[PDB]
Amino acid sequence: GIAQIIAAQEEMLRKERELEEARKKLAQIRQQQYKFLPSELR
Amino acid sequence: FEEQILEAAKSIAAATSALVKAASAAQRELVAQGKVGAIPANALDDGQWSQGLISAARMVAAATNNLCEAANAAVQGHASQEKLISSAKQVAASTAQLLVACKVKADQDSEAMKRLQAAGNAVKRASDNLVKAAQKAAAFEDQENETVVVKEKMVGGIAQIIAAQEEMLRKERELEEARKKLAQIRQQQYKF
Amino acid sequence: DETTALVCDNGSGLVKAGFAGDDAPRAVFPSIVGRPRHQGVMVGMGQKDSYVGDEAQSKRGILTLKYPIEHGIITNWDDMEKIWHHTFYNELRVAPEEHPTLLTEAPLNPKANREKMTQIMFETFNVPAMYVAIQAVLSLYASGRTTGIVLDSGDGVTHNVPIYEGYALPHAIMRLDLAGRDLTDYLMKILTERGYSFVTTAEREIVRDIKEKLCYVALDFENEMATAASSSSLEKSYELPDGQVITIGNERFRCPETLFQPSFIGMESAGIHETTYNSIMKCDIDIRKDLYANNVMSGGTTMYPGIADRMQKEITALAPSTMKIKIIAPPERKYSVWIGGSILASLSTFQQMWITKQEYDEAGPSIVHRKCF
Amino acid sequence: DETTALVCDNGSGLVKAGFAGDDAPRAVFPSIVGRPRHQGVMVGMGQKDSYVGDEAQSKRGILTLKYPIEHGIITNWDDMEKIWHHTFYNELRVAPEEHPTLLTEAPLNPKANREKMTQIMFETFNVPAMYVAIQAVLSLYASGRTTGIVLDSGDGVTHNVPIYEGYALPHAIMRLDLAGRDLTDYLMKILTERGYSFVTTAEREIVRDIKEKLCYVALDFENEMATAASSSSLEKSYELPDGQVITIGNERFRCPETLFQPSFIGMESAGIHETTYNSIMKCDIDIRKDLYANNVMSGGTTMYPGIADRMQKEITALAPSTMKIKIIAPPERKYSVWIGGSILASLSTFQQMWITKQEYDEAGPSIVHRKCF
Ligand SMILES: Nc1ncnc2c1ncn2[C@@H]1O[C@H](COP(=O)(O)OP(=O)(O)O)[C@@H](O)[C@H]1O
Ligand SMILES: Nc1ncnc2c1ncn2[C@@H]1O[C@H](COP(=O)(O)OP(=O)(O)O)[C@@H](O)[C@H]1O
Ligand SMILES: [Mg+2]
Ligand SMILES: [Mg+2]
């Protein structure tokens, strides 16, 4: 009854968490993109 | 660590027992006032509203029981913090459903109504206390393996950018899929 | 203490969501679903399948935009469910299964629309409770009044509902499909007259912005036409997103005039002033004075500069000279419905009017026809 | 770990080959096949039948040089296969049957060209997998962008491809056959004006070197012509391989000007600036701003000194004044296509887009029209 519901919430929360990790990772890598791009690429 | 959640677990148990007693009193008020007919039949065994409010209360208890179990796993290393807060979310949904049902199905001035609202608020606050205690007890509360990585090669860095953005998009698409899966499992659970 | 309720006004063209007790919606975004209509060639981007809300409004160049709600009737239920998902989890960022939800609906809507709304809210989002209210009643609540005739003109529906001392008169409720989106389409049609060609849905959004930023209701239509012909003062310029500048003249007041002369778009119905007067005339003679004195206007389509003065003049020309006519047009009327919902969601007396999940499970969706007007 | 992929930009004039993940091509050599046109008289010498690449560039005195690729279309398949063999076994010195090969192609090319390329890669070299990418998309990859209009001007084909958020607009793709080789021919024609007669293919290579060493794009063509006709400051000298010193004046900037005035060579098409502006105007109105701000140039023909400033001035004269226009011209743009190809082939996601030789054997060469843009 509720076991499947809580399991679906489990997967939803795992994936929300790793999505937020992906956000932080992409942001921090984008922060340093100036170093390996030329001036015209800035 | 484990003792703090166990005290909060006992607080959970006390609050939910008071909630069950309040629900029983509300059911007694409903039949005496003729708000809803009492069929003392265990439709679909426990179900959700067999014999009325108390059935919901039972499931609410059941819900928080799972919550308590998660707490132990949280203090033994078999459950994540998101698991415990998802169980707390289910508990909150159940108690909100029960409280709104009794609020619309009973007199506003009823003493049982005030007891029900107080018990629901106590259950919610104690659940949040258990949630925060278990999250603080778990060492994985603030743990991230991501770090600053960069490549000197212009080909290498742009590859990092594109790979990160691809993980971005694929995770977002899978989040859309997972939301659809959760909606489907909710519809299958109950479809009237 | 008590869990706050969610107020979600899903209009034909805008979704306004927030929490009970607040004085303004927390999330206001277009109710559009965009799907890519080109070929994705760079693997790094172009993997998402659909964009909802402001994202679709920012990526309109490469998207086909569709409104799931047309004339106040939900036509694409998958898209509407997607929009509700976006509203709950992205904009409001709350779990719907802990807050009772107050939804809105235009009067005289199809019954299956309301039943499907209830079924989705209870079986897909698992809300503890719901209530579907009439937008005009919410507007009256927001006005702080118990008597008046509400003229709510949204993106897709324009309806007049008279209420006297908290009692609605269903036989006098008037509904007219002529609304903001029809005005946008007519503005596109008449902008073709100056050589400006807007065809795609993104161009429709651009024309909607032009309408919102440059159109007004003329006090006297013929005099305004004569003035526009004689002088170029009415002409005004607007900058397109691509840098081109377009100048529009009489169109600025020709588009909103369709509100009062629907025949401009081939509709046989009378203008909003005549519909309001007919709605008042359908009411009992003893209550017509208060309705005349309590004209309440809400909705985005009633935000045109000078619309209140034109409505007052038309109704004065229609009504007997002895009656005192007052158009109540608060500056925040574009959110009035939502505001009223917030008020209705904060009343202690309203807490017994919720349609709980117990009633839905024991009675099915049809319960929504026994607890909501 | 995983076997690296081969990136082989088979341009009309040059072949740029290397391994995915590197930041520069390992082998850059002219795509020419030379055959002796005289009689061998030394028994120990003059026996090889054909020279390929840089070797043919060292023996041009006794060779007829032919380009197997003309206007981005492979015309001599035996010569092209010879060049590919020289690339794999001599320059790169690797076995092609272990590395998936990424090949490039100009947009709007004949289907038979791409099908024959696939058939040669799978039947002659037995590559594990292959992929034909569009050069403009790779050029955009190299610049670390997802939005922009790529102007790729190679040796034999110029083309504008607009992309917005990773979505290409195939209806707005423009292709112009005017390119570096036509500029070389026009430079030969106008060098005959000063008495310098270049006729043979080797003399064509000499003129190409002159073009690469002395030609530039004038900011204002008429003022530059007046200055050249008045002063001698624009006259530069160049030493021929036989020791003769030639002096060229306005021909330094009158040659690249053909890119902006194709009528100089009798072509009716418009210049590269007008083609870029037309490609932008063929796009949706909402994305024209981002395209205006992201003009990306690539290819050898865009290495002319001062071409970016001239392009910026022309497009500014064409576009509305409000719009901001930025020409992105990285200093390594002569290898932008290959760098983008390496970036794409190094992606984990791209690893699923490989046309495997399994799919080739069941679907035939036509599979390349279902898996590549
Ligand atoms: N300032 C304005 N002037 C004229 N029209 C406006 C203005 N603001 C909004 N509108 C129109 O009102 C519509 C939005 O009305 P709204 O109150 O959001 O209705 P709904 O209840 O359908 O969301 C839009 O389609 C727009 O065309
Ligand atoms: N510095 C330069 N100035 C002017 N033209 C150049 C320069 N370098 C190369 N070119 C021209 O560009 C062409 C090479 O372009 P390339 O990027 O190799 O195109 P392809 O895609 O055919 O390989 C040559 O034919 C040459 O004439
Ligand atoms: Mg509205
Ligand atoms: Mg090229």
PDB file of N, CA and C and ligand atoms in Angstrom, chain C residues 9-16 135 152-156 180-181 184 208 211-213 215 299-301 303-305 334, ligand 1:
ATOM      1  N   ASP C   9      -4.514  29.829  -8.708  1.00  0.00           N
ATOM      2  CA  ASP C   9      -5.398  30.339  -9.750  1.00  0.00           C
ATOM      3  C   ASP C   9      -4.729  30.020 -11.081  1.00  0.00           C
ATOM      4  N   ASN C  10      -5.212  28.965 -11.732  1.00  0.00           N
ATOM      5  CA  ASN C  10      -4.706  28.552 -13.037  1.00  0.00           C
ATOM      6  C   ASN C  10      -5.608  29.164 -14.097  1.00  0.00           C
ATOM      7  N   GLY C  11      -5.275  30.375 -14.510  1.00  0.00           N
ATOM      8  CA  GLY C  11      -6.032  31.031 -15.548  1.00  0.00           C
ATOM      9  C   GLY C  11      -5.702  30.495 -16.921  1.00  0.00           C
ATOM     10  N   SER C  12      -6.386  31.050 -17.920  1.00  0.00           N
ATOM     11  CA  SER C  12      -6.165  30.611 -19.292  1.00  0.00           C
ATOM     12  C   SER C  12      -4.755  30.945 -19.761  1.00  0.00           C
ATOM     13  N   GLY C  13      -4.166  32.011 -19.228  1.00  0.00           N
ATOM     14  CA  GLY C  13      -2.872  32.450 -19.709  1.00  0.00           C
ATOM     15  C   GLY C  13      -1.816  32.659 -18.645  1.00  0.00           C
ATOM     16  N   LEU C  14      -2.200  32.594 -17.374  1.00  0.00           N
ATOM     17  CA  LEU C  14      -1.266  32.820 -16.282  1.00  0.00           C
ATOM     18  C   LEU C  14      -1.598  31.898 -15.122  1.00  0.00           C
ATOM     19  N   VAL C  15      -0.569  31.329 -14.507  1.00  0.00           N
ATOM     20  CA  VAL C  15      -0.703  30.577 -13.268  1.00  0.00           C
ATOM     21  C   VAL C  15      -0.192  31.460 -12.144  1.00  0.00           C
ATOM     22  N   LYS C  16      -1.036  31.668 -11.136  1.00  0.00           N
ATOM     23  CA  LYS C  16      -0.701  32.464  -9.961  1.00  0.00           C
ATOM     24  C   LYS C  16      -0.862  31.575  -8.737  1.00  0.00           C
ATOM     25  N   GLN C 135     -14.346  32.180  -9.579  1.00  0.00           N
ATOM     26  CA  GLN C 135     -13.390  33.283  -9.562  1.00  0.00           C
ATOM     27  C   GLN C 135     -14.051  34.600  -9.174  1.00  0.00           C
ATOM     28  N   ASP C 152     -15.211  39.665 -14.325  1.00  0.00           N
ATOM     29  CA  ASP C 152     -13.876  39.082 -14.348  1.00  0.00           C
ATOM     30  C   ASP C 152     -13.531  38.744 -15.790  1.00  0.00           C
ATOM     31  N   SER C 153     -12.507  39.398 -16.322  1.00  0.00           N
ATOM     32  CA  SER C 153     -12.074  39.196 -17.701  1.00  0.00           C
ATOM     33  C   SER C 153     -10.642  38.677 -17.669  1.00  0.00           C
ATOM     34  N   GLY C 154     -10.484  37.375 -17.845  1.00  0.00           N
ATOM     35  CA  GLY C 154      -9.185  36.744 -17.840  1.00  0.00           C
ATOM     36  C   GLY C 154      -8.574  36.680 -19.221  1.00  0.00           C
ATOM     37  N   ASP C 155      -7.702  35.691 -19.408  1.00  0.00           N
ATOM     38  CA  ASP C 155      -7.072  35.505 -20.708  1.00  0.00           C
ATOM     39  C   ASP C 155      -8.022  34.843 -21.697  1.00  0.00           C
ATOM     40  N   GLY C 156      -8.905  33.971 -21.215  1.00  0.00           N
ATOM     41  CA  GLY C 156      -9.753  33.213 -22.113  1.00  0.00           C
ATOM     42  C   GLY C 156     -11.242  33.266 -21.840  1.00  0.00           C
ATOM     43  N   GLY C 180      -8.774  38.078 -23.381  1.00  0.00           N
ATOM     44  CA  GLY C 180      -7.485  38.653 -23.737  1.00  0.00           C
ATOM     45  C   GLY C 180      -6.830  37.986 -24.930  1.00  0.00           C
ATOM     46  N   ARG C 181      -6.899  36.656 -24.998  1.00  0.00           N
ATOM     47  CA  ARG C 181      -6.247  35.949 -26.097  1.00  0.00           C
ATOM     48  C   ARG C 181      -6.887  36.300 -27.434  1.00  0.00           C
ATOM     49  N   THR C 184      -5.486  39.514 -28.435  1.00  0.00           N
ATOM     50  CA  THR C 184      -4.153  39.354 -29.004  1.00  0.00           C
ATOM     51  C   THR C 184      -4.228  38.904 -30.456  1.00  0.00           C
ATOM     52  N   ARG C 208       1.343  39.909 -27.672  1.00  0.00           N
ATOM     53  CA  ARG C 208       0.714  40.047 -26.363  1.00  0.00           C
ATOM     54  C   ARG C 208       1.436  41.087 -25.521  1.00  0.00           C
ATOM     55  N   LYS C 211       0.474  44.474 -26.781  1.00  0.00           N
ATOM     56  CA  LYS C 211      -0.855  44.817 -26.293  1.00  0.00           C
ATOM     57  C   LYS C 211      -0.806  45.278 -24.845  1.00  0.00           C
ATOM     58  N   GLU C 212      -0.070  44.559 -24.003  1.00  0.00           N
ATOM     59  CA  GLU C 212       0.022  44.928 -22.598  1.00  0.00           C
ATOM     60  C   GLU C 212       0.733  46.253 -22.376  1.00  0.00           C
ATOM     61  N   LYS C 213       1.666  46.631 -23.247  1.00  0.00           N
ATOM     62  CA  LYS C 213       2.450  47.835 -23.016  1.00  0.00           C
ATOM     63  C   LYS C 213       1.999  49.050 -23.809  1.00  0.00           C
ATOM     64  N   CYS C 215      -1.596  49.366 -25.478  1.00  0.00           N
ATOM     65  CA  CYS C 215      -3.011  49.495 -25.789  1.00  0.00           C
ATOM     66  C   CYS C 215      -3.768  50.156 -24.646  1.00  0.00           C
ATOM     67  N   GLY C 299      -9.316  40.911 -13.099  1.00  0.00           N
ATOM     68  CA  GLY C 299      -8.737  40.212 -14.225  1.00  0.00           C
ATOM     69  C   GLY C 299      -7.747  41.072 -14.984  1.00  0.00           C
ATOM     70  N   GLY C 300      -6.810  40.409 -15.661  1.00  0.00           N
ATOM     71  CA  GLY C 300      -5.785  41.132 -16.393  1.00  0.00           C
ATOM     72  C   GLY C 300      -6.332  41.958 -17.537  1.00  0.00           C
ATOM     73  N   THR C 301      -7.377  41.468 -18.202  1.00  0.00           N
ATOM     74  CA  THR C 301      -7.937  42.172 -19.346  1.00  0.00           C
ATOM     75  C   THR C 301      -8.595  43.490 -18.955  1.00  0.00           C
ATOM     76  N   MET C 303      -7.121  45.728 -17.117  1.00  0.00           N
ATOM     77  CA  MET C 303      -6.026  46.613 -16.748  1.00  0.00           C
ATOM     78  C   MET C 303      -5.744  47.670 -17.802  1.00  0.00           C
ATOM     79  N   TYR C 304      -6.565  47.755 -18.834  1.00  0.00           N
ATOM     80  CA  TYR C 304      -6.350  48.750 -19.873  1.00  0.00           C
ATOM     81  C   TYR C 304      -6.539  50.146 -19.294  1.00  0.00           C
ATOM     82  N   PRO C 305      -5.671  51.098 -19.617  1.00  0.00           N
ATOM     83  CA  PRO C 305      -5.893  52.476 -19.166  1.00  0.00           C
ATOM     84  C   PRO C 305      -7.200  53.022 -19.719  1.00  0.00           C
ATOM     85  N   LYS C 334      -5.499  42.740 -11.106  1.00  0.00           N
ATOM     86  CA  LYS C 334      -5.003  41.611 -11.883  1.00  0.00           C
ATOM     87  C   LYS C 334      -4.718  40.393 -11.018  1.00  0.00           C
TER      88      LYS C 334
HETATM   89  N1  LIG E   1      -1.369  45.939 -18.326  1.00  0.00           N
HETATM   90  C1  LIG E   1      -2.161  45.227 -19.162  1.00  0.00           C
HETATM   91  N2  LIG E   1      -2.881  45.833 -20.127  1.00  0.00           N
HETATM   92  C2  LIG E   1      -3.670  45.134 -20.959  1.00  0.00           C
HETATM   93  N3  LIG E   1      -3.814  43.800 -20.911  1.00  0.00           N
HETATM   94  C3  LIG E   1      -3.147  43.070 -19.991  1.00  0.00           C
HETATM   95  C4  LIG E   1      -2.266  43.759 -19.044  1.00  0.00           C
HETATM   96  N4  LIG E   1      -1.738  42.813 -18.251  1.00  0.00           N
HETATM   97  C5  LIG E   1      -2.239  41.621 -18.656  1.00  0.00           C
HETATM   98  N5  LIG E   1      -3.079  41.776 -19.691  1.00  0.00           N
HETATM   99  C6  LIG E   1      -3.803  40.687 -20.380  1.00  0.00           C
HETATM  100  O1  LIG E   1      -4.494  39.912 -19.408  1.00  0.00           O
HETATM  101  C7  LIG E   1      -4.238  38.523 -19.588  1.00  0.00           C
HETATM  102  C8  LIG E   1      -3.928  37.908 -18.237  1.00  0.00           C
HETATM  103  O2  LIG E   1      -5.115  37.944 -17.459  1.00  0.00           O
HETATM  104  P1  LIG E   1      -5.167  37.120 -16.090  1.00  0.00           P
HETATM  105  O3  LIG E   1      -5.780  37.997 -15.030  1.00  0.00           O
HETATM  106  O4  LIG E   1      -3.798  36.526 -15.910  1.00  0.00           O
HETATM  107  O5  LIG E   1      -6.235  35.994 -16.507  1.00  0.00           O
HETATM  108  P2  LIG E   1      -6.172  34.447 -16.076  1.00  0.00           P
HETATM  109  O6  LIG E   1      -7.137  34.380 -14.921  1.00  0.00           O
HETATM  110  O7  LIG E   1      -6.631  33.721 -17.314  1.00  0.00           O
HETATM  111  O8  LIG E   1      -4.750  34.149 -15.686  1.00  0.00           O
HETATM  112  C9  LIG E   1      -3.065  38.387 -20.534  1.00  0.00           C
HETATM  113  O9  LIG E   1      -3.420  37.516 -21.608  1.00  0.00           O
HETATM  114  C10 LIG E   1      -2.810  39.774 -21.073  1.00  0.00           C
HETATM  115  O10 LIG E   1      -3.053  39.771 -22.478  1.00  0.00           O
END
